[PDB]
Design an enzyme around this catalytic site. Structure first.
Site, PDB file in Angstrom:
ATOM      1  N   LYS A   6       0.850  -1.182   0.000  1.00 42.99           N
ATOM      2  CA  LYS A   6       0.000   0.000   0.000  1.00 42.99           C
ATOM      3  C   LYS A   6       0.890   1.237   0.000  1.00 42.99           C
ATOM      4  CE  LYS A   6      -3.868   2.044   2.582  1.00 42.99           C
ATOM      5  NZ  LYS A   6      -3.455   3.406   2.150  1.00 42.99           N
ATOM      6  N   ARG A   7       0.500   2.250  -0.767  1.00 46.60           N
ATOM      7  CA  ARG A   7       1.326   3.441  -0.904  1.00 46.60           C
ATOM      8  C   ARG A   7       0.820   4.576  -0.023  1.00 46.60           C
ATOM      9  NH1 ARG A   7       2.894   6.767  -5.652  1.00 46.60           N
ATOM     10  NH2 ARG A   7       0.755   6.480  -6.437  1.00 46.60           N
ATOM     11  N   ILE A  28       2.669  10.287   3.554  1.00 47.46           N
ATOM     12  CA  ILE A  28       4.071   9.898   3.444  1.00 47.46           C
ATOM     13  C   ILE A  28       4.152   8.796   2.386  1.00 47.46           C
ATOM     14  CG2 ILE A  28       6.107   9.071   4.659  1.00 47.46           C
ATOM     15  CD1 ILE A  28       4.804   9.856   7.280  1.00 47.46           C
ATOM     16  N   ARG A  70       4.520   0.456   1.535  1.00 46.18           N
ATOM     17  CA  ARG A  70       4.319  -0.282   2.774  1.00 46.18           C
ATOM     18  C   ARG A  70       3.641  -1.632   2.583  1.00 46.18           C
ATOM     19  NH1 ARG A  70       2.584   5.562   5.021  1.00 46.18           N
ATOM     20  NH2 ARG A  70       4.490   6.075   6.196  1.00 46.18           N
ATOM     21  N   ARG A  87       1.246  -4.499   3.688  1.00 46.06           N
ATOM     22  CA  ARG A  87       0.038  -4.708   4.474  1.00 46.06           C
ATOM     23  C   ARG A  87      -0.657  -5.994   4.048  1.00 46.06           C
ATOM     24  NH1 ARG A  87       2.571  -1.098   6.618  1.00 46.06           N
ATOM     25  NH2 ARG A  87       1.654   0.852   7.410  1.00 46.06           N
ATOM     26  N   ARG A 115      -7.225   4.396  -3.699  1.00 46.85           N
ATOM     27  CA  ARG A 115      -6.023   3.911  -3.030  1.00 46.85           C
ATOM     28  C   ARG A 115      -5.050   3.254  -4.013  1.00 46.85           C
ATOM     29  NH1 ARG A 115      -8.372   0.433   1.908  1.00 46.85           N
ATOM     30  NH2 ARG A 115     -10.348   0.391   0.740  1.00 46.85           N
ATOM     31  N   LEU A 157     -16.886  27.680  -5.598  1.00 45.99           N
ATOM     32  CA  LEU A 157     -16.466  27.567  -4.210  1.00 45.99           C
ATOM     33  C   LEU A 157     -15.077  26.945  -4.110  1.00 45.99           C
ATOM     34  CD1 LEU A 157     -19.867  26.316  -2.817  1.00 45.99           C
ATOM     35  CD2 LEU A 157     -18.896  28.613  -2.596  1.00 45.99           C
ATOM     36  N   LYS A 192     -15.381  20.084  -9.238  1.00 43.53           N
ATOM     37  CA  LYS A 192     -15.512  21.447  -8.733  1.00 43.53           C
ATOM     38  C   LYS A 192     -16.728  21.557  -7.821  1.00 43.53           C
ATOM     39  CE  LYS A 192     -18.244  22.872 -12.774  1.00 43.53           C
ATOM     40  NZ  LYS A 192     -18.788  24.034 -13.540  1.00 43.53           N
ATOM     41  N   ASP A 239     -12.051  13.927   8.176  1.00 44.17           N
ATOM     42  CA  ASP A 239     -11.627  15.187   7.597  1.00 44.17           C
ATOM     43  C   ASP A 239     -11.859  16.357   8.539  1.00 44.17           C
ATOM     44  OD1 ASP A 239     -11.869  17.148   4.748  1.00 44.17           O
ATOM     45  OD2 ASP A 239     -10.429  15.491   4.935  1.00 44.17           O
ATOM     46  N   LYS A 248     -11.528  19.342  10.428  1.00 45.15           N
ATOM     47  CA  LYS A 248     -10.574  20.447  10.448  1.00 45.15           C
ATOM     48  C   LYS A 248     -11.355  21.749  10.597  1.00 45.15           C
ATOM     49  CE  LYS A 248      -9.469  19.500   6.315  1.00 45.15           C
ATOM     50  NZ  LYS A 248      -8.900  19.404   4.947  1.00 45.15           N
ATOM     51  N   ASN A 251     -13.536  23.125   7.904  1.00 46.61           N
ATOM     52  CA  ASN A 251     -14.664  22.302   7.486  1.00 46.61           C
ATOM     53  C   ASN A 251     -15.872  22.519   8.380  1.00 46.61           C
ATOM     54  OD1 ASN A 251     -13.279  21.211   5.380  1.00 46.61           O
ATOM     55  ND2 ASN A 251     -13.314  19.097   6.127  1.00 46.61           N
TER      56      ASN A 251
HETATM   57  O1  LIG Z   1     -10.860   8.254   3.335  1.00 46.04           O
HETATM   58  C1  LIG Z   1     -10.488   8.789   2.286  1.00 46.04           C
HETATM   59  N1  LIG Z   1      -9.503   8.313   1.427  1.00 46.04           N
HETATM   60  C2  LIG Z   1      -9.406   9.233   0.370  1.00 46.04           C
HETATM   61  C3  LIG Z   1      -8.550   9.220  -0.779  1.00 46.04           C
HETATM   62  C4  LIG Z   1      -8.638  10.288  -1.733  1.00 46.04           C
HETATM   63  C5  LIG Z   1      -9.574  11.336  -1.519  1.00 46.04           C
HETATM   64  C6  LIG Z   1     -10.406  11.306  -0.359  1.00 46.04           C
HETATM   65  C7  LIG Z   1     -10.284  10.220   0.566  1.00 46.04           C
HETATM   66  N2  LIG Z   1     -10.979   9.985   1.750  1.00 46.04           N
HETATM   67  C8  LIG Z   1     -12.024  10.874   2.281  1.00 46.04           C
HETATM   68  C9  LIG Z   1     -13.460  10.420   1.979  1.00 46.04           C
HETATM   69  C10 LIG Z   1     -14.509  11.442   2.502  1.00 46.04           C
HETATM   70  N3  LIG Z   1     -14.265  11.839   3.932  1.00 46.04           N
HETATM   71  C11 LIG Z   1     -15.235  12.840   4.426  1.00 46.04           C
HETATM   72  C12 LIG Z   1     -16.652  12.305   4.551  1.00 46.04           C
HETATM   73  C13 LIG Z   1     -16.931  11.213   5.411  1.00 46.04           C
HETATM   74  C14 LIG Z   1     -18.241  10.743   5.531  1.00 46.04           C
HETATM   75  C15 LIG Z   1     -19.268  11.360   4.798  1.00 46.04           C
HETATM   76  C16 LIG Z   1     -20.620  10.889   4.906  1.00 46.04           C
HETATM   77  N4  LIG Z   1     -20.886   9.611   4.552  1.00 46.04           N
HETATM   78  C17 LIG Z   1     -22.164   9.161   4.628  1.00 46.04           C
HETATM   79  C18 LIG Z   1     -22.447   7.828   4.254  1.00 46.04           C
HETATM   80  C19 LIG Z   1     -23.767   7.362   4.324  1.00 46.04           C
HETATM   81  N5  LIG Z   1     -24.338   6.139   4.028  1.00 46.04           N
HETATM   82  C20 LIG Z   1     -25.647   6.290   4.294  1.00 46.04           C
HETATM   83  N6  LIG Z   1     -26.001   7.502   4.740  1.00 46.04           N
HETATM   84  C21 LIG Z   1     -24.774   8.155   4.746  1.00 46.04           C
HETATM   85  C22 LIG Z   1     -24.530   9.494   5.131  1.00 46.04           C
HETATM   86  C23 LIG Z   1     -23.221  10.002   5.072  1.00 46.04           C
HETATM   87  N7  LIG Z   1     -22.997  11.290   5.439  1.00 46.04           N
HETATM   88  C24 LIG Z   1     -21.735  11.779   5.374  1.00 46.04           C
HETATM   89  C25 LIG Z   1     -21.505  13.205   5.765  1.00 46.04           C
HETATM   90  C26 LIG Z   1     -22.337  14.251   5.193  1.00 46.04           C
HETATM   91  C27 LIG Z   1     -22.130  15.608   5.558  1.00 46.04           C
HETATM   92  C28 LIG Z   1     -21.105  15.950   6.487  1.00 46.04           C
HETATM   93  C29 LIG Z   1     -20.271  14.918   7.064  1.00 46.04           C
HETATM   94  C30 LIG Z   1     -20.470  13.555   6.706  1.00 46.04           C
HETATM   95  C31 LIG Z   1     -18.968  12.441   3.948  1.00 46.04           C
HETATM   96  C32 LIG Z   1     -17.678  12.900   3.835  1.00 46.04           C
HETATM   97  C33 LIG Z   1     -12.852  12.257   4.209  1.00 46.04           C
HETATM   98  C34 LIG Z   1     -11.836  11.215   3.749  1.00 46.04           C
END
Ligand SMILES: O=c1[nH]c2ccccc2n1C1CCN(Cc2ccc(-c3nc4cc5[nH]cnc5cc4nc3-c3ccccc3)cc2)CC1
Length: 367
Positions: free
Chosen positions: A13-14, A18, A22, A24, A82, A118, A125, A226, A228, A231
């Site tokens: 896994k990359r 970093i 790796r 896994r 991934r 945005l 986008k 995420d 932060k 956000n």
């Molecule tokens: O892990 C990663 N590897 C990556 C590799 C490349 C790019 C990005 C990556 N990521 C991100 C992927 C998204 N990551 C943020 C997030 C998490 C959960 C929901 C989320 N998932 C849901 C599911 C559901 N299944 C059924 N009902 C559901 C509702 C959900 N509501 C909500 C959500 C909505 C609004 C605000 C916050 C969370 C949204 C955003 C952050 C890491």
């Protein structure tokens, strides 16, 4: 329903933050579970939806090395991917797709009016759109469907502190998601003008985050990962709205186990609660340095210092949330969000009240 291992073995896994290579040990089950571990595991427990290969498709490439495949899944509204001898690479990528497709077995582009951009990312986008029929605004996440594909489940997923997905529709080449838009700006702003936040004011934003994260953990079984400062937006009344605008890469907010590419769970969310709340109550990030090798070293290795202002409860909470070890981190236990809710810094609070927005907003947006 029971399930068995479709395939397993060691994988490279990359690293995302970093970018080393790796080792896994992975295993794919026919629930959709694709999970990698630090080492060949024993009993081989309800995993997170994050590690599910539903709605995915794979890929192959010889960069940076000759034996490599890639997965790209549409999780909720985001596209994640991934990066992992050449004969296996056509059986692994055979099984993953099989289960993915086996697991799959079970409003138009303009009522909207473009307002402004945005932000933009590798995979698309994010747009502000006015609904030409209603007038009230929205954010529209527009993903390019050819990076991936080359239900009103969204009424269950309502939480008062998460930006709601109200519409999702497809078109000629784009994947569209219309989420609600919070008017009162994001914290990053209002914390700059204020320099620091009281414990009371930090307990208000932390509480609403915890409600939202509890909800994502118990109900949807997903880690958000995420968390932060940027956000976090406010609605018109000053209540939290956690955003969902991921377009690719969003570090100072990510936990050690994530920068190291180890096994992670619900604990990476609480770490980020720690950073966001430490940042509110102290005025500074807990771990910062212009140099990235120093930044990663601080997060993984170094202690956290508290200003003398900080009460005993506030630092017991931050120290626990910002433990390096996930299984020791406040919240990383079996009860998850509850041991945060029950920490002394949140004493007195009844959490159905936070859900109902009975908490007094420290800051009213002028909207
Ligand atoms: O892990 C990663 N590897 C990556 C590799 C490349 C790019 C990005 C990556 N990521 C991100 C992927 C998204 N990551 C943020 C997030 C998490 C959960 C929901 C989320 N998932 C849901 C599911 C559901 N299944 C059924 N009902 C559901 C509702 C959900 N509501 C909500 C959500 C909505 C609004 C605000 C916050 C969370 C949204 C955003 C952050 C890491």
């Amino acid at each position: 329903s029971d399930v068995a291992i479709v395939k397993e073995g060691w994988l490279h896994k990359r690293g995302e933050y970093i970018k080393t290579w790796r080792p896994r040990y992975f295993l794919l089950k026919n629930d959709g579970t694709f999970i990698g571990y630090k080492e060949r595991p024993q009993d081989v427990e309800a995993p997170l939806n994050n590690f599910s290969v539903a709605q995915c498709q794979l890929m192959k490439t010889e960069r940076p090395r000759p034996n490599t495949f890639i997965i790209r899944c549409l999780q909720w509204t985001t596209v994640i991917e991934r990066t992992f001898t050449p004969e296996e690479r056509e059986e692994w990528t055979t099984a993953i797709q099989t289960v993915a497709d086996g697991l799959k077995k079970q409003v138009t582009m303009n009522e909207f009016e473009y307002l402004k951009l945005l932000g933009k990312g590798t995979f698309g986008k994010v747009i502000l759109v006015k609904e030409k029929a209603t007038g009230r605004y929205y954010a529209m996440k527009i993903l390019k469907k050819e990076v991936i594909v080359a239900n009103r489940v969204l009424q269950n997923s309502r939480h008062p502190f998460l930006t709601a997905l109200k519409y999702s529709f497809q078109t000629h080449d784009r994947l569209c998601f219309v989420m609600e838009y919070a008017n009162g700006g994001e914290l990053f702003f209002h914390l700059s003008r204020e320099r620091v936040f009281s414990e009371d004011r930090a307990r208000f934003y932390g509480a609403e985050i915890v409600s939202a994260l509890d909800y994502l953990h118990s109900e949807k079984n997903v880690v958000y990962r995420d968390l932060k400062l940027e956000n976090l937006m406010l609605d018109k009344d000053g209540h939290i709205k956690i955003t969902d605008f991921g377009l690719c890469k969003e570090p100072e907010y990510l936990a050690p186990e994530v920068l190291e590419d180890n096994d992670y769970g619900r604990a990476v969310d609480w770490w980020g609660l720690g950073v966001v709340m430490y940042e509110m109550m102290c005025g500074r990030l807990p771990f910062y340095n212009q140099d990235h090798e120093k930044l990663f070293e601080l997060i993984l290795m170094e202690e956290i210092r508290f200003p003398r202002t900080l009460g005993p409860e506030a630092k017991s909470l931050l120290s626990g949330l910002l433990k390096k070890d996930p299984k020791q981190r406040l919240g990383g236990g079996s009860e998850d969000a509850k041991e945060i809710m029950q920490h002394r810094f949140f004493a007195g609070i009844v959490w159905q009240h936070v859900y109902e927005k009975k908490l007094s907003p420290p800051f009213k947006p002028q909207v």
